[PDB]
Amino acid sequence: SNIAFYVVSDVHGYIFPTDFTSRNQYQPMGLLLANHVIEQDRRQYDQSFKIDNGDFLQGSPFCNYLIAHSGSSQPLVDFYNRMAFDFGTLGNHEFNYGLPYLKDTLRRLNYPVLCANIYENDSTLTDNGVKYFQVGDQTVGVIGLTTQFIPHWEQPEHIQSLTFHSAFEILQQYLPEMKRHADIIVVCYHGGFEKDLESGTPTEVLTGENEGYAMLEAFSKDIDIFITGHQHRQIAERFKQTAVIQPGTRGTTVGRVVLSTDEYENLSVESCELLPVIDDSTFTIDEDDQHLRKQLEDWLDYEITTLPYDMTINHAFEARVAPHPFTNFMNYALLEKSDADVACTALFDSASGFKQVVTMRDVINNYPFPNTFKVLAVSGAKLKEAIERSAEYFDVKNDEVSVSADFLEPKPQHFNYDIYGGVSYTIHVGRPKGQRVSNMMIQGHAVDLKQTYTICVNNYRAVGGGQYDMYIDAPVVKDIQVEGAQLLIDFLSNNNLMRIPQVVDFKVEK
Numbered sequence: 001s002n003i004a005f006y007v008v009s010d011v012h013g014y015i016f017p018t019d020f021t022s023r024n025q026y027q028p029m030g031l032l033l034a035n036h037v038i039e040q041d042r043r044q045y046d047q048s049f050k051i052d053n054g055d056f057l058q059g060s061p062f063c064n065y066l067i068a069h070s071g072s073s074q075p076l077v078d079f080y081n082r083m084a085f086d087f088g089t090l091g092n093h094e095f096n097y098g099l100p101y102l103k104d105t106l107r108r109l110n111y112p113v114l115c116a117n118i119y120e121n122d123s124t125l126t127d128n129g130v131k132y133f134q135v136g137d138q139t140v141g142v143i144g145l146t147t148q149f150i151p152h153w154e155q156p157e158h159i160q161s162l163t164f165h166s167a168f169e170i171l172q173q174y175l176p177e178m179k180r181h182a183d184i185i186v187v188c189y190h191g192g193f194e195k196d197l198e199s200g201t202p203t204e205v206l207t208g209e210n211e212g213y214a215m216l217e218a219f220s221k222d223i224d225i226f227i228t229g230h231q232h233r234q235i236a237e238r239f240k241q242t243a244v245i246q247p248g249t250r251g252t253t254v255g256r257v258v259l260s261t262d263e264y265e266n267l268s269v270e271s272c273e274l275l276p277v278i279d280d281s282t283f284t285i286d287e288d289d290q291h292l293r294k295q296l297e298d299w300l301d302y303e304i305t306t307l308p309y310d311m312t313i314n315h316a317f318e319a320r321v322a323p324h325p326f327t328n329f330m331n332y333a334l335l336e337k338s339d340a341d342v343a344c345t346a347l348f349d350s351a352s353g354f355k356q357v358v359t360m361r362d363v364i365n366n367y368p369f370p371n372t373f374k375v376l377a378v379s380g381a382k383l384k385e386a387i388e389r390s391a392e393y394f395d396v397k398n399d400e401v402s403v404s405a406d407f408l409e410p411k412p413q414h415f416n417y418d419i420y421g422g423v424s425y426t427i428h429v430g431r432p433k434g435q436r437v438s439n440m441m442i443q444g445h446a447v448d449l450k451q452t453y454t455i456c457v458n459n460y461r462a463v464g465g466g467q468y469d470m471y472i473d474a475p476v477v478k479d480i481q482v483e484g485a486q487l488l489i490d491f492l493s494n495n496n497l498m499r500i501p502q503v504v505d506f507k508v509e510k
């Protein structure tokens with residue numbers, strides 16, 4: 001006899017088969033299609049379970065649409081609810097819209113969300129962290145865990161009553177009890193691997209954000225299935241006898257782990273793989289769902305303004321190695337809103353800049369996170385530390401400036417590179433990290449390392465996101481409670497002539 005476990009992770013509100021780059025876009029992705037793949041495939045097994053492993057409440061323009069309309073997650077919850085999932089876990093982005101929004105979401109879902117390591121006051125935020133069920137005369141035990149690193153990213157007001165414990169420590173403490181109750185153990189961790197599974201070599205700085213390797217290294221023999229996410233990587237292999245899965249993101253793949261009995265009726269791992277999400281001739285989207293997609297596209301097509309010139313980004317890297325009218329524009333909007341000496345923003349992966357006609361679609365693609373902003377008081381020396389962190393983004397390949405391996409592997413982190421406004425500088429990539437920034441000037445004057453300056457950063461950066469630890473606890477001069485997309489919309493609506501001064505002025509070379 002057998003049992004199959006299907007998992008999607010980091011769906012990120014990509015339900016329809018589109019990434020929204022254009023209205024009629026259609027691509028083999030999204031939860032509708034990924035679920036269709038599960039439904040067809042699962043029928044061959046004696047029984048099966050369906051799991052969402054986090055980062056389901058935020059991510060796509062559909063999520064923006066929901067906040068902007070009823071403020072309710074119900075339309076999204078309805079999709080999950082129809083599909084008859086068995087359980088899920090919490091990802092960090094589940095907190096992006098506040099704790100009440102999350103709590104309301106959990107009570108609207110028709111299956112439990114398991115999180116054993118996030119406490120609210122003196123108990124788990126979620127009703128439970130562990131679930132047990134029978135497979136024949138055996139018992140399966142499931143424990144849900146979430147990356148402890150949330151304080152380094154989220155709005156303080158969204159997590160103020162919460163306590164985040166190490167996933168490794170909570171697992172370590174629960175194992176003994178789980179093994180007393182169950183024969184098969186399944187860990188669903190919304191987090192990834194900090195070391196390469198085969199070599200054990202660190203693949204990122206060991207901050208505790210990701211504890212998957214330490215968990216396997218210490219407890220593999222007692223774990224049958226190790227479900228992971230967060231890093232958006234595609235993994236399906238064995239760690240000793242443990243089946244290890246990471247099913248990417250946006251429903252382009254589905255993780256499937258099959259367990260089957262041997263003589264003695266003992267369940268063992270039969271297979272562990274990623275199933276490709278593909279279109280087929282039986283897949284259909286019902287009328288109501290297509291009506292919702294249309295409303296969504298209609299909203300995305302809403303015209304914000306018409307600019308007198310183009311600010312498109314042809315090649316992302318070009319808009320990172322040197323000033324670009326669009327980065328100049330973003331920084332200028334932040335300087336004008338905040339009145340700080342300096343501002344900064346990352347160029348996000350979907351940021352293609354603006355054409356002359358700007359729609360809601362374009363604004364969201366250029367600022368896809370619900371970040372607010374903060375003006376921080378920092379010494380000129382702390383400012384330099386922040387520019388040196390960004391300068392780590394570059395490396396030299398051949399005799400050309402390129403992107404550092406550190407920011408591409410195991411997966412891309414371009415969003416951790418910032419472009420600054422109000423301060424001019426020179427980055428020398430051939431010099432050691434931490435001493436690459438030269439010629440710093442703020443308004444005709446050299447940056448005095450001992451003087452106090454102000455910088456507008458997003459809330460993610462304010463709590464240290466992307467290893468910008470120098471901003472933590474910097475005095476808050478201004479708390480700007482306007483999210484990025486709206487801040488750009490406001491600026492666009494108030495400055496018709498769009499005469500933008502040059503606030504981004506920097507150079508990158510060896």
Ligand SMILES: Nc1ncnc2c1ncn2[C@H]1C[C@H](O)[C@@H](CO)O1
Pocket residue numbers: 092153230369370371415458460461465
């Ligand atoms: N500016 C930002 N605002 C909100 N979230 C962001 C930002 N940049 C990265 N992320 C996401 C990506 C990962 O899920 C996680 C970092 O490991 O945070």
Ligand SMILES: [Mg+2]
Pocket residue numbers: 055091092093229230231
């Ligand atoms: Mg995540």
Ligand SMILES: [Mn+2]
Pocket residue numbers: 010012055091230231232249
């Ligand atoms: Mn994610």
